[PDB]
Please model this.
Amino acid sequence: SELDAKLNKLGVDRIAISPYKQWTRGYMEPGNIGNGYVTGLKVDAGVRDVLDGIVSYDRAETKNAYIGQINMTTAS
Amino acid sequence: SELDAKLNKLGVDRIAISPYKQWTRGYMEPGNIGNGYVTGLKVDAGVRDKSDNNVLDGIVSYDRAETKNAYIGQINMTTAS
Amino acid sequence: SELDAKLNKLGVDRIAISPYKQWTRGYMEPGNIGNGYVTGLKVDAGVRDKSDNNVLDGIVSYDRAETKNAYIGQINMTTAS
Amino acid sequence: SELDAKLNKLGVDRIAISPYKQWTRGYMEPGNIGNGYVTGLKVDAGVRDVLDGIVSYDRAETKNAYIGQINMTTAS
Amino acid sequence: SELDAKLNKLGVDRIAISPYKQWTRGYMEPGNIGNGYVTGLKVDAGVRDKSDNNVLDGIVSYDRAETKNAYIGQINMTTAS
Amino acid sequence: SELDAKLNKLGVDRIAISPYKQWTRGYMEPGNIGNGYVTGLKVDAGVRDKSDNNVLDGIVSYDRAETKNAYIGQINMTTAS
Amino acid sequence: XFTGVQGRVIGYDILRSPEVDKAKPLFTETQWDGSELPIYDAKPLQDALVEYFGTEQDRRHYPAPGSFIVCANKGVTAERPKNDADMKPGQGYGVWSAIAISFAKDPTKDSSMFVEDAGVWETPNEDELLEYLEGRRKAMAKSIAECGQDAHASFESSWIGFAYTMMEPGQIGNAITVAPYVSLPIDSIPGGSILTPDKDMEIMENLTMPEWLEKMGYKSLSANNALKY
Amino acid sequence: XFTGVQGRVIGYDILRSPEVDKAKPLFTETQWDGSELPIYDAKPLQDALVEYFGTEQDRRHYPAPGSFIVCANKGVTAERPKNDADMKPGQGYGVWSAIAISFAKDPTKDSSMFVEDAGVWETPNEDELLEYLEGRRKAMAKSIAECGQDAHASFESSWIGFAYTMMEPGQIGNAITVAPYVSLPIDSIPGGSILTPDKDMEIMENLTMPEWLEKMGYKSLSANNALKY
Amino acid sequence: XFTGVQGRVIGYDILRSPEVDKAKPLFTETQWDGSELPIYDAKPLQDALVEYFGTEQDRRHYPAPGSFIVCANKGVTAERPKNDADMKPGQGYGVWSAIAISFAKDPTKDSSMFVEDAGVWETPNEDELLEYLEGRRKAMAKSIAECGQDAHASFESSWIGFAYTMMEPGQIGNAITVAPYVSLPIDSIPGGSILTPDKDMEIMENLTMPEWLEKMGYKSLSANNALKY
Amino acid sequence: XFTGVQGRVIGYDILRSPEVDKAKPLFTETQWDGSELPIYDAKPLQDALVEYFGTEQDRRHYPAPGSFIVCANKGVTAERPKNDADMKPGQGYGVWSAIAISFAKDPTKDSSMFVEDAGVWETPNEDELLEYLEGRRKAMAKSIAECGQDAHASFESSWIGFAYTMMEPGQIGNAITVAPYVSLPIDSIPGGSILTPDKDMEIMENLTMPEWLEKMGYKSLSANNALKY
Amino acid sequence: XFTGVQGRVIGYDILRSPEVDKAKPLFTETQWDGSELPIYDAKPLQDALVEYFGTEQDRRHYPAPGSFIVCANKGVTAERPKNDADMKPGQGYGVWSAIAISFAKDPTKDSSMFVEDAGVWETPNEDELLEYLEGRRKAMAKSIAECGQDAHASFESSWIGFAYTMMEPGQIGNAITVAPYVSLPIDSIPGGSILTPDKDMEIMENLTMPEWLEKMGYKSLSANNALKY
Amino acid sequence: XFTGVQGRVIGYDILRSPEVDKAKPLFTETQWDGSELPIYDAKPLQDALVEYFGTEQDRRHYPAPGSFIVCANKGVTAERPKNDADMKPGQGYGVWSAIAISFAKDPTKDSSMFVEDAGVWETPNEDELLEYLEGRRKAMAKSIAECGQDAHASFESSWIGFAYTMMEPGQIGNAITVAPYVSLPIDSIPGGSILTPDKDMEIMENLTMPEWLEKMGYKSLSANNALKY
Model:
């Protein structure tokens, strides 16, 4: 978009492409094409009747927008 | 420096270059030229007259210290230890 | 192995090569050749006799377990979960 | 164009970009971005009143569409 | 083969891979993977009942030999010697 | 040199590095590091005593001049003009 | 967190939801320059990510098995005991999470920001919690506006949304808020190619989420608000 | 030569000349499938390359000093003696060169082809040469059509043009035909960027040569046929 | 966490321990498809990483000074007071850590998983702890099996192992569990080369840990169970 | 954290502060080899990073909006209540943070290390805190020296510095210690170029912080100790 | 031309012809070290390239339309006039071309060499030409052996082959000798991948030309000597 | 050809010969701007390339076996018959080759140029040829100066040199002139590294040919004019 054109003059691009079939993958992983990233919003909570933390976690990760089996790293 | 020359014989370089205009950017980000990193020292402490929310009371004091002195505001901080 | 061949048809490879002499290095670091990773299992603990206050005495038992057995001393550990 | 899209499915692209300021440069030279080429048509002859071959040559190379001072390599 | 292993210690590899579907392509072309080349042997002789023009009488007999037997038709031949 | 600095502002560099052990190699070959070239001057000739017919006896005087003095023997010479 | 000069947000910048332009602001909060920053419910954007990754059951362009996705994330977990209706205090009846994205006015100078929060609920009245959540919103807006002035980053909108649960009976509850940072596969891009990277991004930022679905043969997983958080 | 799956031709595929669509075929030659291959004068295309590289005097995006440009090329040189009006036979009065480009019908399966020729002129009548050149055209068409069947490559058009000279008085003459193979600089692409490679090519193939000029602030070096070959 | 389509595990997928095939399952736990997932002690695999990185004292292909290794990790620390044999409760007598790896049955569709745990020990009887640890195992198996169904990922084995300590006298204890994610150096690969990347991986997945050692001139640091955790 | 074979530290290895060579050690602590490791105040180095990134108000080569900077960092936050001068114990009057860098003697074999700490202050006397901080220093030195022997890494210097605050009146306090890991922009390098990467680093390690400023047209933001932590 | 440290030859080093090992030397020529260099007919190797590129009619992995293939090549063309059975001397009755490849003994130190020749035939007796060609062979061997000593490159074999034609009736004849320098497509490599480059080469150098055909579903275009030159 | 913005010439720009600065011009030729372009004998530069590639016998950093070196080159060959002292005219007694390099005054705007020539000698007096060669020089200078104006490229020097031979007795003679275009190996660069590319070039352009030799342990193959052309 017209913004990318202002951006490119600074050395910045927002291209983020995954080499794989079907799957997205994480920003900074090797073999991605492009120097940018795409993001999105997930908020979920599941009610279920260290391990404690882990199984309810997976339950929220596979609830709705699927991000199951990901090696989550944190930024803040 | 003469140390880089000892280093290079091991496969290591300390080159760390940002493609951008003005901004530095983080080690390991795509498009950086070089296989090394530069680091520096920041210690600062900031404040803000309370609210209801501890989470949001740490988030806003956080930003206050990040933009105090050496500016690292609006960065996606990741932690190593 | 025959699995890599199924993998490659999806765009995936498990090649993970370090440019350096002797040392391994971390997945995603710049200059590594390949788009995969190798992992391993370390569980260690110790007994590390008394001190001066919280953060510092902690940090030191840490180093003690990092250099106990399989050596990962002096690494900038980043966490995934 | 729609043809490039048929082409790309075969591994082929027609992207040919020069890293320099102002100048075009030759297909296959290092640092060009892209795996394709652009071509064009030059026919010229200059009347002028081994060396013989060389100076009239330059005269036709700098006549009209300028390709002067190029290290011409031949394909046929 | 065992020779490639002696070669690699000198910085040389004989890897020559074409990005395309079906077609081979020439050594040194952009986008080829690898830093080596593969070669082969073609000797053929072709003809065509004359015209007015020697230039064009070599161009058309040329094509005739290029598309005779092992097909290298429509290639931008460059010469080494 | 100070000229390279004027050059670099145009996108041009004169870096020309061979991946191999001992050998130089040609500009534009894959795996060379850099986007420039180095050149030099060779003029040589010889006296190479009589033979069997055209192409072959020629080729042999050629090799004789290529391996006379500054060695460029066994090269796949391509021509620019 | 942040999304700066390198980023785009699903549902907004690429694969935009009709719901987004049709959205009406819940209210406005003032910021340091004196602009009224409108605040919106993030439901378009959240549903949007479900269309793209898909669900456990309708898996679409989700992250690769074992991939390393860096995320902006916070979580929290709590028990609501067996009968023992006395909360030894890391305990509670309900649990919630929240996320806000505030789009920078000038994405060339300033970054867009994410704010995420989470806690437990010390009461059993679901409705009482709800009242509280719409309070937390205005609190987050204030945290956005504070932060804005910290870096003199005026924003142009904010989109905030929540999820939660009301546990009972020794069922443990976990609420997570997370903004992932990904790169898109070619087979998700209608007519994209591994050789046309920059055009690929322009296809996605030029499609609407309905068009993207129609062209991918994908049934809308939201449409008549079928998605719950 | 050839221009195959990797190429585009200035004046035709990118930066197209209005003159091209407005062109009217000089004639047609039959080819192996039974299609009438129209034949055109290549003047649009030749003028086109002058707009892009420019002239010695109005240097534009010409090749880099010392660059290695591979070209399809043929040349020829000849003296037309001092007085000595007897041609010891590598000699002649005039000298000429020619180039034809034949666009493949299916650029996915087949390559477009270039045919180039050159010779000397054994007569002093400029007009007599001209007559001959328009003969050579139909000869080249025949060489195109022969070659076409060699590889079962039907073409969809051919564009042929010539340049020459009539020497006199010990002035040596040199005629060259050359199709260069280049890569385009970013400052030639109105609004292109070193980070948007594939879009850059689409800008050039979407501009006409007048638009490209107007946007670059470039005066047309041809326009009212100001260009001679 | 996970190890998916991009990964291999030292001791199992590359540089495999004889101990691995010779291993006998401690037991099996059922999973959602009705397969009995065997469970094993992870000691082969743990010793395996010691052969490759080496020890402080016998440093081999350990990570580079200052390198950034992302790891799946958990730790925990605790005092066991000076005399004051009353534990003000973040205190304890012993401390432990644990790690399990569960290899996916189909590594093309599903990721292998790591589960790691850690805690303190409120008793001084080492043996009493041990009893507890072998309990924790079956608990972890259950947490594996739960998780398995979450993503319909059946596994084919699990390998679980622990380390710990029994502190006394104001000695602080720290237990860490960590799965590092590395890339291998060429001088660790017998006959590998920086120019043969994919073959390099095949060398390592075709060597056994004894062969790798014999070819590297490396003395086995485990062999007669010489390695303690 | 660590800074090993791949790193350089601003103010010391590149853009060195005159203050650094002119520094005088606050004291020495013994380490495992029997060398007296001198210890210094880190103020040169801290001011140094302010010259390079600049301030909110004088923004220089700071990190890109939304960039992902991995940092060695610790923080801590605390209230000092409204009036209610009784600290329910996650509360305090002051708050502090600290960072130490210990340069390895042999940066080829060993990594340089960072140690960072943080806490709250249970007293209102600013001076009483200060006394404590200069105590914490020698404690950190001891933690450096312990760690040194862990890896038989002798260092050659340490540079330690603190920042803090004394809150009152329900003002919450946050202290952060952070060592960021960046890559330098070309427009920060006087006479550097995107084509000369390794020379670019040599320019920065050959300039002093005054020279760098003079050549960049940058006013010193420290100079007469104008910078407070 | 030469084929040195970077090259492999189709039919010999990769996709080897059974005919090659089954070949019997036509004779030996001495070289500077005193080794008898055996000389063979190149027909296995020539047929070999036909299996891989295929023919106009059975197009297989031939070079890309418009690609730039550098080749070692020589050609020659001649008329054999209309009736006018007097050869104005660039004319002749037949025309021929030849190619030899001499594999270096030590491909680490020395390059393998190609020698190629071509001419016209001044007689109409096809058989008389043939006699001459088998003479030319021993001449080429001598040119190989001369050249060998020039660079002290002993070879281990030579493989020489010819093609030609006997024109009559104003039919022009063209003989070409050419050794092309290519890179292989993945779909030609049974079970190769764009991610396994070095293994791809090892597949091709481990297949025989029959195996390669059987695995590609390709009918042998030579087999019972069906290929003419 | 040319050597433009991308090139450096051995002996002049890198590994410079003392002989070069100590050289004294043989004469000057005027060029289009009115500058006296000095002309020099190219012997420093020619000897220079012998120091770097070495000889058949003292092989140094010569081109790789089978490598593809593009060169500016011309050659010529001729017989000087058996006795038959009558030259059927492609025959002669001696044969020569020549090369000139003219360094552009502004290497940013203009390219440096190479001019190379070759012919046969129709007389047997070696000295008579020599007289002729020093004539050819001034002719080449004129061809340089003509060309200079063609592109308004003023040069700042020219360096011209020749080699030849005087055949007799059916010995065929071949004279070649060639300017190769190479890239330098790391082991030729005293203290260079595959990781420091741009510094590598600066090492070579900062060494003199004597220093380069002394540091490489290389005996000067010229020194007391030991090199003949």
In short: The helical segments of chain H are 18-22, 43-53, 126-151, 197-204, 209-216. Chain H has one domain: 2-229.
